[PDB]
């Protein structure tokens, strides 16, 4: 049904081997209580500092892609204080983001955003 397409980095041979097509996200809700859901309007691309991911050492096979985001706040978790829905914010996704920036909606910690 409704799906949101997200590009994922693959960790192989310590660097320079990133590839894959964007993979679906199905029925993603806005769970957690400080993470807000955005209608992403723009995603900037940056060279991935892969070596930093490797020594940073998280164990994923797929890493989320896209971190420099601008968009409109769709909805917020209950503990959110600085942000309301329909608000227009911009921000950096964290390096250890759960969700890719190459996607039209995003769940992101609220203190990575600014109006």
């Amino acid at each position: 049904h409704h799906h949101h397409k997200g590009l994922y980095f693959q960790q192989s041979s310590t660097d320079e081997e990133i590839t894959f097509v964007f993979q679906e996200k199905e029925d993603l809700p806005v769970t957690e209580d400080n993470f807000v859901k955005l209608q992403v309007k723009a995603c900037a691309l940056s060279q991935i500092n892969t070596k930093l991911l490797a020594e940073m050492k998280m164990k994923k096979d797929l890493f989320p892609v896209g971190r420099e985001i601008a968009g409109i706040v769709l909805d917020v978790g209950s503990k959110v204080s600085f942000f309301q829905p329909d608000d227009e914010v911009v921000g950096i996704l964290p390096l250890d983001s759960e969700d890719p920036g190459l996607c039209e909606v995003v769940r992101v910690h609220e203190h990575y955003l600014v109006h």
């Binding site: 400080n34 503990k79 204080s81 203190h111």
Partner: protein, 256 residues
């Protein structure tokens, strides 16, 4: 404080002693009322055990690697309701005591002095309850800085912290007032009515346990007096910087 909070079990012991004290005056509406009153009195162990358990939880959250300016107060929030749980029962037992003592007056007490003085004792009991409720409404309001303090009057409750130190220190004497008043009340009740061995059986434990509680209240009073300045200084890191510390559900993000 956790060690002194353990002393409340002595209050629980004397409350059970108070139950058997009432059972003793049954041979000596009151007949249904005493059993109903006793059944409500049995509930206290259930009511008060979370109070001490929650205070233990507060101690668990006050452990190091956590700033705990007001953060550890979230357990205090549970503790506040737990203290409310105690005092609800105390408020639950408050009118029940007043009538019961009147029915205890209905029991043969030829001497007017014992009858009048125990009415004064019940009034004193009402007073100790009243200061105790002042503490509970205070502490429940003190839990509001932990979560969503819309009022934001950081300066106000910095001063407010002193009030229980005064209330608690006076409460030590108020409990002593109960103790001394009860001492002759129990003694005279032991002296004239029969079943002296049962009278001694209830009176010795209630009198000693209330004296132990007065010791416990004195420990709380001395404790609060020494640590009162530390808590007021602890709450406010700096001028206008206390409110930033008390900002809701940012400190939790800050702990993360």
């Amino acid at each position: 404080a956790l060690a002194f909070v353990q002393d409340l079990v002595t209050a629980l012991l004397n409350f059970h002693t108070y139950t058997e004290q009432r059972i003793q005056i049954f041979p000596v509406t009151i007949s249904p009322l005493n059993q109903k009153f006793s059944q409500y009195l049995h509930e206290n162990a259930s009511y008060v055990r979370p109070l001490e358990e929650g205070m233990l939880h507060l101690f668990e959250s006050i452990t190091e690697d956590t700033v705990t300016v007001l953060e550890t107060t979230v357990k205090l929030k549970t503790f506040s309701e737990h203290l409310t749980s105690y005092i609800c029962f105390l408020r639950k037992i408050l009118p029940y005591q007043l009538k019961s003592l009147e029915e205890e007056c209905e029991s043969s007490l030829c001497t007017s002095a014992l009858r009048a003085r125990n009415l004064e004792l019940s009034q004193d009991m009402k007073k100790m309850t009243a200061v105790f409720e002042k503490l509970q409404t205070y502490i429940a309001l003190l839990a509001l800085p932990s979560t969503e303090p819309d009022g934001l009057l950081r300066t106000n409750y910095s001063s407010v912290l002193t009030n229980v130190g005064a209330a608690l220190h006076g409460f030590h004497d108020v409990m002593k007032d109960i103790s001394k008043h009860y001492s002759q009340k129990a003694a005279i009740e032991h002296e004239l009515p029969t079943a002296t061995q049962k009278l001694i059986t209830t009176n010795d434990c209630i009198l000693s346990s209330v004296v132990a509680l007065t010791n416990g209240a004195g420990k709380i009073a001395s404790f609060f007096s020494n640590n009162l300045d530390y808590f007021i200084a602890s709450l406010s890191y700096g001028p206008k910087a206390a409110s930033g510390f008390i900002s809701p559900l940012s400190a939790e993000c800050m702990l993360q």
